[PDB]
Every structure is written in structure tokens, then in C-alpha cells.
Amino acid sequence: SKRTKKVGISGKYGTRYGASLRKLVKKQEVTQHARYTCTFCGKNSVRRTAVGIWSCKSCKKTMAGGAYTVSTPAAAAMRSTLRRLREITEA
Amino acid sequence: SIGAKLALVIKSGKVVLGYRSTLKALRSGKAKLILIAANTPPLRKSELEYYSMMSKTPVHHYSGTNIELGTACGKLFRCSTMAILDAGDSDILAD
Amino acid sequence: PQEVSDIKKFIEICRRKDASSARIKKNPKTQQIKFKVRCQRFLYTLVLKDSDKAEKLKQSLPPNLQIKDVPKRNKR
Amino acid sequence: LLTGRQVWSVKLNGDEAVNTVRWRPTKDTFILAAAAGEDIFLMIPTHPSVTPALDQASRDILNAGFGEPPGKWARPGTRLEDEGVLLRITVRSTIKAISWHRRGDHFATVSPSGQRSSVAIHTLSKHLTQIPFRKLNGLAQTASFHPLRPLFFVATQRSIRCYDLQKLELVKIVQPGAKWISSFDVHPGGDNLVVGSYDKRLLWHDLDLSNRPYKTMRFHTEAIRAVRFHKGGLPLFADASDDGSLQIFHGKVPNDQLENPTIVPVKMLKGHKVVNKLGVLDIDWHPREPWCVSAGADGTARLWM
Amino acid sequence: MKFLKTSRVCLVTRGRYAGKKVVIIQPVDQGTKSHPYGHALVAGIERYPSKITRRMSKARIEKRSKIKPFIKVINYNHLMPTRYTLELEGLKAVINADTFKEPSQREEAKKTVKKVLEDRYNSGKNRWFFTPLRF
Amino acid sequence: APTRVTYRRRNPYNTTSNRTRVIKTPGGQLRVLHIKKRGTAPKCGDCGIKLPGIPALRPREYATISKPKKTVQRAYGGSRCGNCVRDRIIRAFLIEEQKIVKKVLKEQSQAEKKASKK
């Protein structure tokens, strides 16, 4: 039973702040309130503690991540690039 | 290849899934192969490698996580490590 | 306040030099007798049923220690 | 007793050892209780004292109540029924101690490592086994009934807990100084205890006096295994240790029970052989005579007179 | 193969003797009615000998050389087996289940364990066994 | 009957040190009774779990009770829990064993290098 056609989590803001700003805050709010799978224990229990901080309730590990997502695409691209320059430097 | 070997092992041979049953198999000495997932905690990984060195059983380091190891075993739950006690029709030991 | 369950330990408590006072309280509705001894730190209460043991304990107590019966009204 | 003739024998549970044997205190039954492993065997031995009337009375008292739960009362195997064993009671763990009530309607069993079910009370007429006290502080070693009042003593390694059975309550805690209480026995008057320990210390407790031992004594080099009072008016009690020797004690309790009891060592009984660091394991007294029978780790029982 | 055999050295990870080094006197893989799991009967060092120095006097040397032993029935799950092995001929069958039942027998066994371990230590082998684990 | 009560100390504010509970006296009156704060259990120094076996008291009340009431008979007892002590023991053993193995392999490589140089 879908209760709102389009606003979703932004329905708490009512008719205020403008449609575009409610739609803009909706993306970050969904991705910051979602649960993630831990890369250390494999359970779906990683949630945000503060801005940039992501903690797992099962294995008690705390990670430094993005503001509203657990990881940033720029950081993932850096991880790949850093690996490739690591084999370039070592070899 | 390793996934097909595990599928044949589940179909024909005998396994135990999990850390405590794997430890009991290593203590009994009837373990033929020990599979350890990539994201297993390093302390548990070092302990299982030490146990396998004492019992002279081979260790395969599965590149996937515990979710992917459970999916490879055909289970709907996670599995960090497992012990194959009987190969059945598969050739997973001959490697 | 501490409870003593047994008459002999009550007797050496009364024999101790710390034993300041001693009194006998009779509860007829409950059919029991309490022997109380006040010492330096604690008041010790021994609860006995209606028997010859209470009256026999009364002479079995030390005679230097004053033993008093509790009246019906505690007057100030 | 006097001849040493073996008039009866039966192998109860095969490999399982028989930890405890106790006669029923009533003269009118001639019923023997034995503990082998986790099982209680109630039996009527084939003895010259047994008449057909006595055997019939014993049989109907044993099986009157016929006409996982704690305790499983059942008939034994056919060979055991032919030998004379008529009841088997199964409990959770291995039984070490049996105690009989003086009326003969109840017997208690102590089974260490039975956890909450360590001490069990069995009512023979009701065929009913119950656990009255679930949590006892520590691992239970021995149990006994008070000779004159509805009280129950449970000996743990450290303490002896005295319980009132009617209210099912804890009325007293007795504190011997022992690390490990080996055994204990209660005077027929009911106000005194002897506690023997693996710490080679024998302890006389006067229940009216204190929760700590009135007398502390050490007459053996090795650990004390059994202590036993004489029943029937003789002021004697015996102590059995792992050095293979008995110590006989004169212990007199005054009747006015406000004068302290008198304990004097009277005899050392020797000649029993020690094998594998174990000596005398159990001791019993004659009902009316100053005679004692001691059990042995060497495989012989000895009667001293 | 089986590594939890007699003379295998293990580390206790649970209980009062957690962190102590023990040697397996008897492995019971199938279990017992009292202990229905794979367990072992071990003898270990509760108090290790103190470190001694070339400058120490002889009397101080035997003073700081005593070993306090213990004997235990221990679950396999509470043991950490080691690649080390302790071949002692004086430790053969010094304990069993009846020994752990009988309190005089266990204190008699501890004297034998103390004497044999102190003799081996003074002989000078198995320094890993006679040193404590730092954790 | 009078069911309303007053404070018994001169602090009139509902602060965290002004906690009370209601009693009824043998004189039949309802009264307040000023109570202290609830003590809390000691926590493990590694995982932060509550340590079993130790009372939850205010900090100065631990000076009045005896030592076996404040400890567990184990290494790190009263500071670390059994699981954390077990992980400490296993990790210590495994890491020193791997140090021995790496030292042996380094000696083998050094011997091979010396043989190649000579």
C-alpha cells in the first residue's frame, strides 16, 4: 500500500520549501537513512552515526565514509587508481 | 571452476558449514579441505590456518565474501568457512 | 538489628563484656518470646516459641547482666 | 556379620559401580536401596530373616504406589525381578549419596553435577520424585534428615545448609573451615554434627553454639572419607580416612544441652591396607553394640568389635 | 591427522588458568557421561619459574625456580593446540577420571607433576613450555 | 489523609542530585526520602560490555567491599571479559608463532644470499 504518490520520505515537510528542494533533500535523506551491508561481517546492519561516520551494530566496526552515502564514487575511483599506481610503483 | 566444484561437492559428497563444525572436523582429522572466505576476520583466519597446518589439511582462500560462499554452497544464509570431508564425484582435492 | 536463631550463641553474646542490656518481650497473640540483648554495635533478638526453654534460659543467663521484662506500654 | 558368610549377591548395572547401599530404617520391611550410576534399585534380599509374610509386606510396600520429569519410577528387568530387585528409579546424573527418612516413606539422593536437580526427594508410597531446592550455592555432596524434626541437611563443598521441609525454607547455614567437605553425620539428639573433610580436618559443630566449628581436630595424615555416629545410646563416633586407619572417639552430649559436649579420642584401628592412595571409604555402627564395619579400597570389609 | 594426542602442548583460553600452557595427558575424543563432548586431561603450570641471571647466587637460583602445577579436565573448545610437544616419561598416566573424582589422588598427582616438571626445567629443555605467554 | 509531601533539604529544584522516593512511616504519614543515584556496572576495557560477577555501585563504595567481590578469578579479571581475554591469548600466540616463522624464512633467505655472494 503506497501512501504517497511521489514525495516519499519528503512528506514530512508538507507543502513547504518548494518542490525542487523537497525532491533534492529526498535523495540524500533516503540514502542516509538506508541500511547497508557491512564489508567486514557481511550483515545488513551498517547505519550512519554522524556525518561521515558509518557504524555496524553487529561487528561494532566504525568506518569513515561519505556524508550521506557509506562510500563516495570519487573515493572508489581513487581506490582503483591508487591500486594501479601501486603496481606501477612496485613493478 | 571452483563454484562448479562446490556444486558437485554439495550434490555428491559431505560437508559441514560453519566455524564450530569446521573446528570439530579439523580436530577429528577427517577434514579433506578447508575453505575460508575473503572477509573472514584475520584472527579467525590465522587460527583456522594454524589448525589446518596442525592437521595437514589444505586451505583454499575463497575470493568471495561469506554471502557469496553461502550462495556457492546453495544455501540462503552466509557462511564464513566450511569443511569438505568427502569429495564425492568432484575433483576439488586434486589441485 | 540482628537475629540469633539459637540460645547458646545468645548466651555467649550475653556473656560478652559489650553486652549492655537485656530484655524479654512476650507476644501472646503470636505465642512467642523474644530475648533481646543490646551490645556495642548491634541489638540481637532471639525468637523462641512458648516453651519451658524461655523460663529456663532466664536463669541460665548471666546474673550480672540485668534482665528486664518489657511492659505493655513503653512510657517515656 | 559374625561368620562372614556371603548369603546373597546380585550384579545390578554391569559396569556401573555401586556407590551407596542403605537399609530401610524400619524393622518391618527388610528393604535395601542401592545406587548404581544414575539408577536407584530398591530390592528385597534373599536372607534367612525373610519370611513369606515379611516378603509379602515388603513387596506390597514397594509396589503400593503403582495402584523430562525428575525421577522415573519403573519396574526393573526380568532377571533383576527374579533376583529380588523390584524398583528402579532413573534420575539425570550419577548418584553418590542416599539418605533414608526414619519413617521409611522418603529417601533423598544427592547426585553431584545434577545442577538444579542435584538433590532429589523420593516418596515411596506416592512413587513421586521431586526437587524441592533448585539453587544451592555450590556443588552438593551429601544429604541427611534430622532425626527428630522435619529438617533437611545438604552438605556442599564449603557449607552445610539446613532446611525446614514444611515451609521449604532455609533455616540455617553451617560453615566448616574446609575447602572440600567429604562427609557429615548428625547426632541422634539432633543438635550436633561431625563434618569430615578432604583437608584432613574433623570438625564438631554444635548447632546451638555457632555456625563455625566448636571443635577442630586432626588425627590422620591423609584425607578423611567417612564419619559416623553410633545410634542407640552409645556415645561413640568413628572417623575413616585415606591412610587406611579408623579413629574411634568418645563423644558425650549432656542431656540438659546447655553444657558443651565432651570429645576424647579413644582408639586407633589399623591393619587396613592402602591401595592407590585410598584407604577406608565407608563406616557403619551396630544398632545396639560397639561394633563397627569399615569398607575398603583393597576389596575387603572389616568388622571391629 | 589427529593432533590432539598425548604429549601435545596446548594453551588454556578459558577459566582460572586462561593463558597457561598445558600438556595433554589423555585425550577423550568421544566424551564421557560426565563430560559429553570432546575433552582432554591435562597437566599445566599455574606459576612459572622466575627469570634467573648469571650473577645470581645458587640459593636464590633454586628459590626462583619453583613450579606450581595443576591438573585439569578441559573442553577442546577451551584449548589452543601448539606445534610443540612435551615428551615426559614420568607423566604417563599420572591422572585419569577417577583421579579427578578422588581429591587425595589429584593432590598426590600434583606432587608428581611438580617434581617431573622441575626436573625437566633444570635439565634445560622446553624453554617455550616453561616461559609464560605474554598477552 | 494528607497525601501531599515536601522536600526535606533546602534544594527546591528537580536536579539530578535531588532524587527522592515516597515512603509511608510507622506514624502513618506519607513522606519523601532522599536517595542517591543508581550505580552502574563496570565495563570491559576492549569491547565495552558489562562484566558479569561485579556489583553495580557508586565509585567510592568499591573501596568498602573485599577483593573477590570486585574481581573474576582469571587474567584481566574485572577489567576484560572472557571473550576478550580469549582473543588476546589466541592473537598473542598466533602472532609470536608467525614472528618465529618469518624469522626462520628471513634466515633462510639470508643464507641463500650469502651462498650466492660467496
Next chain:
RNA sequence: AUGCCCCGUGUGGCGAAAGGGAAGCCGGUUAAUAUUCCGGCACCUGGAUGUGGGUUUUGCGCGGCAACGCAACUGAACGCGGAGACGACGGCGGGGGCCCCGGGCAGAGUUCUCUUUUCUUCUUAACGGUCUAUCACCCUGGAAACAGUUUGUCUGGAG
């Protein structure tokens, strides 16, 4: 032990009768004070020094697989940790007190008529002993025909 050695971390004070904080309750008493006086019954902190216990003739206690238990349980420098010590809001559960209903004893009021009636007292402190109290943790065991389970969907081969 006519000197030598060790260590680094700095720098003192004031600043809250609502923050942090060692420990007291009941009854009575005055014209007027009372957790302060009286009576009874307790507690905390600091100090000195005995007795009884514990340990020890092989110096530094024993038990339980374990979680841990036991009246004690050698412990200097140097280190590690815990408590003090922590937001707001929402529903759920446990406890105390208050409110409510019934019976009984005693007393009071109503009573032309009715009303086995309406109302009042029926209480139990600090401090101790003992038995209990959700989470959490330990042992066995190995779960798909997935299960357990909350008002609220979390937990489980990392058991």
C-alpha cells in the same frame, strides 16, 4: 649509599547553597528549633593496635568444561582500563506511592419511609539477613518445508 642514580609533566590561586560529591532513620518533645534536642535503632570516614581465623617445613588458597564461585587469597616502580560521566522525543514492560472496588472488627452519622446502610482508623522507616527478580554471557547441538519473535521487523552456520 662528603657522593651517585631515576623521570618528564608541567607549573599557582579563585570561580556553582540548581553541576560532581563518604555517611541517619522512626517515634516523641517546645510558647517558639528540630533528618540538629530526647529515646530507640544505624551508618561513614580517618587513625592506632590486639585477639581469633587464612597462608607457610615444597613460600605465596581451592572448586567449576565454561560463564564464574568461595571469609581471606604476597605484590614495589612503571603502564592499561573502568566508574564519576552526561542530548531531545515516542510507544512498550516491571516496581513504589496515590486513586478505585469487596469482606471483617470497632466507632460515628442518618432513620416519616427506605437503606445488612454512608463515613472514619486498620500503618510499618533507615539499616541488615535470606530467597528472588529482564538484558547479557557459557555448554551441547547443527537449522530450508527457513525458524524464533515485538505494539513497533529484527535475530540466526560470525551458530
